Amino acid sequence: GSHSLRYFLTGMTDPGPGMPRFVIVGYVDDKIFGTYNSKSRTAQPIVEMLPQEDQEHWDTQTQKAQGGERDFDWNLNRLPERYNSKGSHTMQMMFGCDILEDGSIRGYDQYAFDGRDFLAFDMDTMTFTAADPVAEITKRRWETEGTYAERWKHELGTVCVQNLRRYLEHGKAALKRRVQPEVRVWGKEADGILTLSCHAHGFYPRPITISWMKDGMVRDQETRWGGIVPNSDGTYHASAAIDVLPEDGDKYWCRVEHASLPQPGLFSW
Amino acid sequence: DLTPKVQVYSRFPASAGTKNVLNCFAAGFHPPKISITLMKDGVPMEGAQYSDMSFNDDWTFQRLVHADFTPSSGSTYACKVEHETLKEPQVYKWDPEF
Ligand SMILES: CCCCCCCCCCCCCCCC(=O)NCC(=O)O
Ligand SMILES: [Cl-]
Ligand code: NA
């Protein structure tokens, strides 16, 4: 068992009508476990995953998130002028930790400004890396103050892993519940060619593979994949298509492998 | 580029007259402000909900919008997307696969 905790933080000068200017979404193994935003000013668990959470934990999460909102607001009111500024701007942060199968730990801590790399912090060497000479200014100020490095060594290597263990335990029912995909194979003709589409609906967990086979042999060369995309209930969706002559339409199988299937499933049109 | 890449799909394999959920997923775009509207025959579907703004590892933003619906073989479903990178709204038609 290798597991991951990740936070995705966005601050926005122009989020759009009725939308919060600062958002946090937290993930455990590609399941959203909680969120914060600047409209509610409240960090809240996803009760379908974390059904019996104590208020005190989330009181703490709320105050830490409100501090993050203040910091993003401070930076959004400074970085545009420093980069030289006139349009809308965004700030982003992703950080978290992994617990590898052998118990060793990894920390991640990366920032972006207007959608471009800005700053990273490496927990194991306690060093920063700046993406450009403007970011370098913040790098040098943070390392010279000598405070950020120790706080985030703690935050990533101690607090994050503790919270990961807590979420893994509290959310074990949701995290371990396998959901088999429902697979639909479809074909539509146009300009004299048959496009065969294999759609896998509603699987969990997230990893899946989909291949197209003819006469039992794989045919990757003319396959298009749509990617793994989310449903709103925490399951996922994935797709694959292939173009073929309408005569050979009965000769193609899409092969679906997923942890919920003891053996890969073969589906035809 | 940084225009939205959009997929429209139903939560369950679709069949006429059976309750379902219609999804519109936009990804790979920047800036994060974006308009995403599910429609039935050009009419905004009621009860639509949006995900909390988030982003991919490469920093590009993404958003899922979904709404309960009962697909009808007589109807066209689509997702209308407006974004700063887009001179005009983009309409993505749902392919029902009935
Ligand atoms: C489950 C999602 C909601 C709860 C999330 C928990 C909140 C943790 C977020 C705090 C991180 C904000 C820090 C970002 C800005 C920054 O670098 N300030 C300097 C510093 O904190 O050292
Ligand atoms: Cl079959
Ligand atoms: Na706000």
Residue numbers in the entry:
A (entry chain A): 1 to 84, 86 to 270
B (entry chain B): 2 to 99
Question: What did the published study say regarding this structure?
Answer:
Here, using a mammalian recombinant expression system combined with mass spectrometry approaches, we identified N-myristoylated peptides as endogenous ligands for the chicken MHC-I-like protein YF1∗7.1. YF1∗7.1 exhibited the typical architecture of MHC-I and MHC-I-like molecules in which the heavy chain was composed of the α1-and α2-helices that formed the antigen binding groove and an α3-domain that was non-covalently associated with β2-microglobulin (β2m). As previously described in, the YF1∗7.1 antigen-binding cleft is composed of two distinct pockets that differed in size and shape and are termed A′- and F′-pockets analogous to the established nomenclature originally established for CD1 pockets. The overall pattern observed for bound acylglycines and glycine lipopeptides was that the acyl chain, which is similar in all molecules, and was inserted into the A′-pocket, where it could promote anchoring and is protected from exposure to the aqueous exterior solvent by the A′-roof, a structural modification seen in human CD1 but not MHC I proteins.
